[PDB]
Amino acid sequence: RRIVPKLATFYSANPNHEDRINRLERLLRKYIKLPSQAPWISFDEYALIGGGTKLKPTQYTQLLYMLNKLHNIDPQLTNDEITSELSQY
Amino acid sequence: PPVYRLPPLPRLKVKKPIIRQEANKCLVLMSNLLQCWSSYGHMSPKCAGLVTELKSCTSESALGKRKSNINYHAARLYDRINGKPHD
Amino acid sequence: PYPNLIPSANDKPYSSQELFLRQLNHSMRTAKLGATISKVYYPHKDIFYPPLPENITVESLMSAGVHLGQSTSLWRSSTQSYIYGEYKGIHIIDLNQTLSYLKRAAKVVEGVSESGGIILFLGTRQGQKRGLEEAAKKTHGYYVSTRWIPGTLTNSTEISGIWEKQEIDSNDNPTERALSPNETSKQVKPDLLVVLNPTENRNALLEAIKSRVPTIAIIDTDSEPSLVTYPIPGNDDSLRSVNFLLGVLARAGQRGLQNRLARNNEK
Amino acid sequence: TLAELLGRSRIAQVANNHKPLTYTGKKFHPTHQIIETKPSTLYRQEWGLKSAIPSKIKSRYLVYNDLDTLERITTFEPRGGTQWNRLRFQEMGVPIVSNIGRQNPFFKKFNTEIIGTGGLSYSLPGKLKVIQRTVVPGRILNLAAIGGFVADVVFFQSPPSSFNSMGDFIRMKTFLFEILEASMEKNGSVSMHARLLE
Amino acid sequence: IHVVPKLPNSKALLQNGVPNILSSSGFKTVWFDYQRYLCDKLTLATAGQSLESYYPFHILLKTAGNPLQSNIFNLASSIHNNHLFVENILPSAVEHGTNSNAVVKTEPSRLFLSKIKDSFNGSDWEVVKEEMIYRAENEVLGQGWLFLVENNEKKLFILTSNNNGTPYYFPRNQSFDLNSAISIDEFATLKQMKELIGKSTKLNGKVQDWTMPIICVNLWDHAYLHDYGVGNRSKYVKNVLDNLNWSVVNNRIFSGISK
Amino acid sequence: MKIQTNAVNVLQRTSAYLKSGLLKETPAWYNVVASIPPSTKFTREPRFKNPSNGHIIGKLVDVTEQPHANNKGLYKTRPNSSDKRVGVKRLYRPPKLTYVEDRLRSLFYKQHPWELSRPKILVENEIGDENYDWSHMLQIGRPLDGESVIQRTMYLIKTKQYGDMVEAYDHARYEFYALRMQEETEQQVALEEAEMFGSLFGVSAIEHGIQKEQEVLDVWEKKVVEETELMAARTS
Amino acid sequence: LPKSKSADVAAGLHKQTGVDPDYITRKLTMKPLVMKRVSNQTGKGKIASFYALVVVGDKNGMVGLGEGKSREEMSKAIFKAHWDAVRNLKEIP
Amino acid sequence: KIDQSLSKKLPKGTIYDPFDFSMGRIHLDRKYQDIMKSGANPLEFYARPRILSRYVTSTGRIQHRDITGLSAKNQRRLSKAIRRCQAIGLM
């Protein structure tokens, strides 16, 4: 066996946050064609799961942007996978 | 013809980048009084049609009124614009 | 795959929530079989279906822009050996050499990947966030898209001990076993740090040299062909180029990864 | 050969030109060749130049003079758009006398002078689209810019009220003009005549 | 460059062909020459032009405005229409079982039965077959195609496709024969269209009409003049309309759900 | 920087640690950079011939290799200044890739500036599969451009169908015009015909030419609303 | 649940650089060379410090000169210096 | 009726653009706004006080090579011709 980092972003500055963003980005690409037509976790709340002390405002704003756009997908066309990913936040 | 490369500098910021804001609008108003008081005497029979303006300029605030973002533009586009040799 | 669907009904005019699914069926199925554009490069390519190390050619590089160099005004003289001549104030690279350099480079990745190698492709110019991510996707390698936290390698047990480490097997199967505090608290050195924009990531290059870690980069007509183990003459600027070169290295890595995950099957 | 490859390179297919990217001088003929990019490359931020074009650019058409320069950037103006003017000449459908076309329709060792239509026209002069042309709307300068080409406005009688109606927005107002005709002075300049329908 | 798409088991077509419809011949002056001629003509038009990276069907739609590009567009549509045409006239025999397919062709599919019923007000599809011939004979003065067309109004109607009209973009279906003077009532449709599209694209949006075509029958000279003949223009339509592989038509109707 | 040592010398460095005890387990990569040793020479290798103009870089005209008094009616015998100015840097100096075709390119574009205005597919697609028979100024894949005219004049000067470069180019220049002339008619035909065959058009070249222009007028009109007026107060 | 100076010096680098602990604690000798007391004129009072060059090497074929510095204790800087040297070991031909 | 500083008047000869018809453009232009300069021994005009009268701040003053912008040699010979003309009665 081998001891190895879990996240592919491990070596980056804030790896956990980057990983979290990547899943949302993947979802957006997948459902990029789906037509578009609030209570998101706080910065501090996000930090505890995300980067912690290494979480920056810009990163949080980006995360919010990613979530909001995904949420905006017309409720009728939305998927189960998307909703599961958004459930966290 | 045109050509004037510079020598490397700590940074190419700008001094007080002058954005320009009109002179205390009041300062112009008070000035015109003394630009129509020198002649015609104090409270000129004409300045009635002037002090009318310097009134509220004071009132609540005797001084009716008691930026730029080029330094970062410079800080970010100098290590690129400066034609430094390689390294 | 449409749980939220209410097939309009009978007289209801085509529901505009599913009308689109008709266009989706109109695509994957009928699509445009009548006339199909061929012999045409797409930015979609390279990053996904790349040339195997042996399939490369000078023309493929010239097309991908792995030749156009920096200006005949910013040339670190340290490459009169990799330059092929000047054109339009640009120093065209001797791609003939680039090929030899890319050939060898790819070889290192495959061999490294065939040895549980920990590759960590690094690039910071805008656009590589995907090409790189996808590059490590294939070789089960690791990647960094933003700026390289100075200290990642040397000052590791400080910059990178918060992140967790997973015990992987020879088929890269998470062992799903506990890693002791001290065990998970040490150094996870990379065994082949690929750099895609050497011009401005030395902090990593210099660190790896002092980290006894082999490096592989994409030198230009300005980058110094010396701070790296395997220099690969190329064009650092354009991303089609980098994505071509990275792609070749990526697939070289994949083949090894494949060959390695195959020995395990024998037993 | 390395050179053979470059000798056919699209980069070299485009000739060099250091003409200013502002050219305050009166303009008649284009100065540089616009570089067209498939929307794909635009998202890939690829333009085939020495350095990638900044995402700030959202056009698919740009003009470049220096693949790259000392300032470590490529000198390009994303405002390359002649594609519109010339096409509008086709939208205007009017041919150029081109002096006399002895033998060859454009006639003329090197045809540097009197180059010809200048790629502004490759159609038989006479055709029936002329049917009184197609009264193309133009922006009266006082002269009227029709399809990006100024044409002197002419009328049966001078209509001051028409100019008064647009006031100082004479150029802002666009009036259909039965183009009388156009011509390419040897300096590659098109001179045309308009028909103010007022 | 583009590549004329290989026909299912063209092996037979090379000397054999589509039963009844045509032996070899035909496609020799169509798929294996006409199609290429304009496929190349487009590939030659696409040269140096983004319009190419994308399938010409995408271009066909793309080349909607800027009518100055119509030259390429008309040809483009013809390219698209023809393959749809070949698909309708595709023998597309089923494989496996080794023995030659027994052509148990599913005729008017179940869904198709109701589709036409509503489309032509409780009328039989086969009834439409000759009605179609009636329409085509009285809706063409030269070149064109025939086209069953499903609409957002699920009326699976049929459109008077001409020369190389856009079976999708209503504003460019090429139905009115501007050459043959039309009754003021068609002009009313013209007036509407002038207004209808005038405001649709007015917000950067060519009428988003999901007018999806269904059954294509080329009416170009190559279609009939090439072999069947002149007065046989209708007669050629006859055998074609007599039998159409439904597998494709079955999959030319948004009949089910997906994601 | 300066040709560094601790970059291409990692195996040498690790080997030592591996033989002593500073390391216990070899860095996996160890073997790879052994199998594929790192090019260490960083020599400014010299050049001998220009890859393009076929010129030679490395010769001197010994005087004996000459006997005709120069145009300047004069038999030169003693070697001249430049002819003794050690030109070693020239060998290392990368030579200019001069191409007469490039001159023809500029020449054609100067004579036909609208060709530059014409969109060109500078983006090069797999240049490998591009063998093109250029006896005709048209090719499948490659679009029409002044570049085609240039690659065309080559046959007429290589195959020698015509004579000198000037005459050759012109022969194809008229060849180009024709293709362009026919295209112009084709362009109009699409519309005219389509125009006279059930065709509606949302916006034409004249329409973008007016809408965008009128849009601009929105800004200018509002702008002068401040400038002209502000001056009245600025001067009254 | 949780030369000796050298034992730590090594452990830290083991957890960090990857050098093997045993080699550092049993097959090296740190012999200080210069142990001075430099100082800085901070405004908050002349501050002193302890520069130290402690050469550690295996008397077989590997030497490394490491420097160091503290403001608390000279031995503290020596520990740091053992570190900078075990870190900078180099084979002497 | 309108002020000058707000209305480009491209001649018909040119190619007007949608932007070209804008104020931005006007500002832009402003920002980017000679037989001696041709190559005639400027000194030969040691007399002709007419020709030399040109490159002169109209105050018996020659101009720094920021305005004149004539070739170093051309400007220095022009300056010498002006100085020589001072000696040659006229100017």
Short mmCIF file of C-alpha atoms in Angstrom, two decimals, chain C residues 1-8 10-43, chain E residues 1-5 31 35 39 42 46 52-59 79-80 83-84 87 150-154 168 208-212 251-255 257-259:
data_model
loop_
_atom_site.label_atom_id
_atom_site.label_comp_id
_atom_site.label_asym_id
_atom_site.label_seq_id
_atom_site.Cartn_x
_atom_site.Cartn_y
_atom_site.Cartn_z
CA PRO C 1 -33.21 11.12 -16.42
CA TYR C 2 -36.02 13.71 -16.05
CA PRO C 3 -37.76 13.18 -12.65
CA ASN C 4 -39.31 16.71 -12.71
CA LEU C 5 -41.42 16.19 -15.89
CA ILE C 6 -45.22 16.55 -16.45
CA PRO C 7 -45.63 15.44 -20.11
CA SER C 8 -47.91 18.42 -20.95
CA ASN C 10 -53.29 15.94 -24.72
CA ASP C 11 -54.24 19.36 -26.26
CA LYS C 12 -51.60 21.19 -24.18
CA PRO C 13 -49.18 22.93 -26.65
CA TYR C 14 -45.68 21.30 -26.53
CA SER C 15 -44.48 21.90 -22.93
CA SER C 16 -41.49 24.29 -23.19
CA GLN C 17 -39.94 22.36 -20.25
CA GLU C 18 -39.59 19.21 -22.46
CA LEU C 19 -39.68 20.77 -25.94
CA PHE C 20 -35.89 21.03 -25.31
CA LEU C 21 -35.68 17.25 -24.72
CA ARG C 22 -37.00 16.89 -28.28
CA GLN C 23 -33.99 18.96 -29.47
CA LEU C 24 -31.83 16.69 -27.22
CA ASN C 25 -33.24 13.62 -28.97
CA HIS C 26 -32.91 15.62 -32.24
CA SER C 27 -29.21 15.73 -31.24
CA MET C 28 -27.76 12.45 -29.86
CA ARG C 29 -29.56 10.35 -32.58
CA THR C 30 -30.32 12.34 -35.77
CA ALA C 31 -27.95 15.26 -34.96
CA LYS C 32 -26.24 16.26 -38.26
CA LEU C 33 -25.26 12.96 -40.00
CA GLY C 34 -26.06 14.47 -43.45
CA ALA C 35 -22.92 16.67 -43.55
CA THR C 36 -20.16 16.35 -40.90
CA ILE C 37 -17.14 18.73 -40.63
CA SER C 38 -13.88 16.68 -40.70
CA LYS C 39 -10.07 17.28 -40.77
CA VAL C 40 -10.61 20.29 -38.42
CA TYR C 41 -8.88 20.98 -35.05
CA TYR C 42 -11.16 21.78 -32.07
CA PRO C 43 -10.02 23.40 -28.76
CA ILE E 1 -13.10 19.39 -44.74
CA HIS E 2 -16.50 17.58 -44.54
CA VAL E 3 -17.06 13.90 -45.48
CA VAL E 4 -20.12 12.63 -47.45
CA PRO E 5 -21.46 10.15 -44.85
CA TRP E 31 -25.25 10.93 -52.86
CA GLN E 35 -24.07 15.47 -52.54
CA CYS E 39 -20.63 19.15 -49.91
CA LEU E 42 -19.69 24.22 -49.00
CA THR E 46 -16.33 27.13 -45.39
CA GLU E 52 -17.18 24.88 -40.86
CA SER E 53 -15.81 23.89 -37.47
CA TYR E 54 -19.55 23.41 -36.77
CA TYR E 55 -21.66 20.82 -38.66
CA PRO E 56 -23.33 22.53 -41.69
CA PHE E 57 -26.71 21.77 -40.03
CA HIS E 58 -25.57 24.10 -37.20
CA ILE E 59 -24.32 26.49 -39.94
CA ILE E 79 -26.72 19.30 -47.80
CA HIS E 80 -28.82 18.82 -44.64
CA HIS E 83 -29.23 13.36 -45.86
CA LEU E 84 -32.68 13.62 -44.25
CA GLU E 87 -32.63 8.64 -44.45
CA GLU E 150 -43.78 18.34 -36.59
CA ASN E 151 -44.47 21.67 -34.82
CA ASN E 152 -44.63 22.83 -31.18
CA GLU E 153 -48.38 22.55 -31.90
CA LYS E 154 -47.80 18.75 -32.20
CA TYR E 168 -36.92 24.63 -39.56
CA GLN E 208 -37.15 29.99 -31.91
CA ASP E 209 -39.54 27.76 -33.91
CA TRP E 210 -39.18 24.03 -33.09
CA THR E 211 -40.62 23.29 -36.58
CA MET E 212 -38.72 19.96 -36.80
CA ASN E 251 -37.20 8.25 -34.14
CA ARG E 252 -38.06 11.60 -35.84
CA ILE E 253 -40.89 12.38 -33.33
CA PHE E 254 -40.28 13.62 -29.74
CA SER E 255 -42.31 10.62 -28.47
CA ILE E 257 -38.93 11.55 -22.11
CA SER E 258 -35.20 11.55 -21.12
CA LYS E 259 -33.52 13.95 -18.61
#
